[PDB]
Amino acid sequence: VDGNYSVASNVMVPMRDGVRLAVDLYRPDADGPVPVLLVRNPYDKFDVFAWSTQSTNWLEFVRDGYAVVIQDTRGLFASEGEFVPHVDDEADAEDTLSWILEQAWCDGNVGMFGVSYLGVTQWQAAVSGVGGLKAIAPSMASADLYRAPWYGPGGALSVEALLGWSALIGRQLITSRSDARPEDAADFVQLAAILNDVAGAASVTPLAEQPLLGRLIPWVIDQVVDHPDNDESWQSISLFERLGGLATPALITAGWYDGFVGESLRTFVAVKDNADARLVVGPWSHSNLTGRNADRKFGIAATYPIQEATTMHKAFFDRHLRGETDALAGVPKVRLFVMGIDEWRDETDWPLPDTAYTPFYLGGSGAANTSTGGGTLSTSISGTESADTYLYDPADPVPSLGGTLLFHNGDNGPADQRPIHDRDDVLCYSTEVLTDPVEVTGTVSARLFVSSSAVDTDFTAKLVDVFPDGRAIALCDGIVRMRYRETLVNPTLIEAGEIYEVAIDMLATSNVFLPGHRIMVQVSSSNFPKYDRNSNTGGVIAREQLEEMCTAVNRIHRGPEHPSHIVLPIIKR
């Protein structure tokens, strides 16, 4: 009967190596075989409520005649084997898809959907070239694990993401244990302590010493902390280069304040020529999909629209798994929440056609240090060769406030920056108060002319919307670790005092700066614990003791000969 279904729990699916993974089957009451959707989940297939509010009302898919299969990944919960992040997911997905294809109840069309880890696994599934896989819908995900979430395009470690997540997995490994252990109760409490104070846990040096996390999940050191370069151990699990080869439709969801935003958007750009790609980007962080934040509210329309997402996914799967060629009529290619005007808007492509990548140059009379310095931003090249200078001290890094934080205060993306404005290592450059709106929608980057007293250091840039009431709301940011200025693969040190021109990848945003506001840029050399602090030594940063580390006198050059600037994706419509 249409609308009706049954659920089979713990159906055991064998992999090529003989290890069995557990799945639940949500199957519609139907005569024949049906199209099937797969979700690969490290957080207990039973616990459907934990992730689904970030995704879709997917029981609707089942009431509409799709089967849904939810799998425990290798070594977790009801599945056999050993858990190690990422490394088995390609082969386990491929084996799972073949098994589904072979079933009486599968009509030979298979899709996937899901958020975060349930999104990353979909790219891993898609690169196996299994013909029966017709569509994916990776939400808040990445096809390159180095670039998101563990490191980034700037070559700094996302220490808060790493510790927070590892603590979360650790806690799961315990609550679910095969045979319960004496140390469990106390370990559980310690992992909670990390989660209640991620910045504190990230502060312990050497970073590479993790007695609890390294024991519970060795991968934390063996893979992540020990591999600061984008080396073969990373490329081995990276899917990105293979994406151009694909012809798989993808429904891609991202958030402006989500740790994966940079990489989600890249996946859209990489697939859009070869197959039907769709993009949806709201003002969300990884753990906050409400549209409400401490000092910034986007309105109820900004709240993750779970029912509309469901309708959209259903239309998408109906088109690609059911051959219903008109299912996506009236559905835009790209849908974006444009902040400032705080409104959803349709677009024909991403990047937007007609994007004017516009330089805004750093200038001003006298020191730019602090928000009451004289730093300016202007579309005109600065008149005179100046330089702003500050001391960066690893023992006192600029604290992270909003942005794409994941676990450490990850529920306040559009954070007010006023608490860090009076600091001397935060350089501020702002436009005059605007009398006309300025839409900035696209990827964002900075070109800075810099020098350091040290042989390595970091530089950060943050785009800020300054409100008339005083609120200075974070929009997007990035970092470059100087050793990785040219390449993430073969780092080289720098000469003290030599001027370098560096690119800072600041991910992306969509904001209208309204009349009465200013456009601002904060420049510094740290953003902790979003990124781990550079030791300023040229050493292996994660193996260094705080006391071993150096301070750095860092300098930003600006003027006609050194035209440092942020490049803004200006839209005029």
Next chain:
Amino acid sequence: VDGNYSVASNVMVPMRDGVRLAVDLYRPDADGPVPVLLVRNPYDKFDVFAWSTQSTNWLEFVRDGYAVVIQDTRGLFASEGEFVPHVDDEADAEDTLSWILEQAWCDGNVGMFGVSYLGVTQWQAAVSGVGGLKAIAPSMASADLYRAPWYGPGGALSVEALLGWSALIGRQLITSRSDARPEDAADFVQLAAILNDVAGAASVTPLAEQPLLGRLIPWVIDQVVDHPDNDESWQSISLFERLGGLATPALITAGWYDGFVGESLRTFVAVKDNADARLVVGPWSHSNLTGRNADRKFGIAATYPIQEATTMHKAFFDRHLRGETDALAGVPKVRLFVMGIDEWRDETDWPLPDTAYTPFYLGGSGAANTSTGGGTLSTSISGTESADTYLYDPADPVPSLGGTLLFHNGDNGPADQRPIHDRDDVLCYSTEVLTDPVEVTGTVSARLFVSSSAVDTDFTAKLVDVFPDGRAIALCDGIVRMRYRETLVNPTLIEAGEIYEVAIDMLATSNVFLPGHRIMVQVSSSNFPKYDRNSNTGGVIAREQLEEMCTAVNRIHRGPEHPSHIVLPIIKR
């Protein structure tokens, strides 16, 4: 097969009057009949994700051999009939329970669970004396609709709760419509505008003029706004008096910052002698179960513990629906999140045995106006007859900040009160900085000696924990509308200038004020839009125009002859 189940959608259940309600059946694969759990839902039975993250991982109940029945209430979604809040729920629940009892798959034991409206409906079900109903688990609910959520023990209208909720229902009535209408699109937008600015919507006078809400849901005026007294129209839907008659076990969940907290706790007290009652209270507001707020974090242990709640409910239903007499061994009678120490703690009863209801007297030299006035709190009666005076102007009420707000900024219960401290109509009284911890856990109230220049006015009291860093965190509060000082049923005006002794019911809290903190009380005459503003006229407040309203010179008397005080539930353990 154990673990396995099927789901039947839109099974149509007839009521005594011939109208049919839609249910979904989640039934385990079983030989015989099973125990059954019922959930009565105004927010679409299909949409299980919207409420369930506030409740239980209830699919676990189905995998463990309970049937679960989810019903659309009368007139909503798949159900026939007309929707009017509350009035049909008793008879519709009773009819539904009989129908379940009559089914092949029901073993004659029925329970209920659910949050908010899904909690209120359970008390409505429980008063029908249906023998087969063996247990309920009303979460964040009330047995007296006047006292929560529409008015309160003080006799002021909860205007923000009323408008916010009505806008929410309005939006549902539209999205689900039988035959779609031309006005729908624009009405939808207007209801969003209310939800984005509840305080703004509450500001329009006369309150009783609601062209949009009154048209969409007439009940908003006909029942709620037109009945400011606790009259027979309220008692008609009140379950509270009948609760003493009952012998039904109840698993009761509440939040310290939840609009229903006062009434949830009362239901526990009313049933605990007659049947197995259980209580769980965390630091949550109605829409924020994270334990995280703008200026206050309770730690990850404070996060609504959905899996543990599931285990607890299962143990509870196993005991009362399955006759498993040892199922609740080791499970405490009462479980509370004690703020300050921020820890879960077991208790043997609520109110705690050994509660010392202790007077803290208002004192101080010179005016108590503002946080930098001289207002004090002390366990000793004040030496000298003083009085603090202020002007309350309805056109400028004290704004609501945290507390038990539902829709207007309802996600920040423990709000920092500093933004309203420099105001002249906020009187502040605080203790010296504490050198020993003081646990305040229980119901809280104030006795104030007051006078007014007007023939009616409000008085408010708010308990505040002042942190060493400056944060002044709201804990609990209340109001008395002076016409209702003696009774909620037969109001009488007051004589200008005459001194009255009034009680203010401040609901309940659990907090340890740690050494370094102070205990503080804010006294005023408004708290808007948590409560609607008193017009200071003696009129029908909701029918009055702002321009028609009066200001009031209000006065708090303190000293030996007028010993105004807050009564605090002191625990020493």
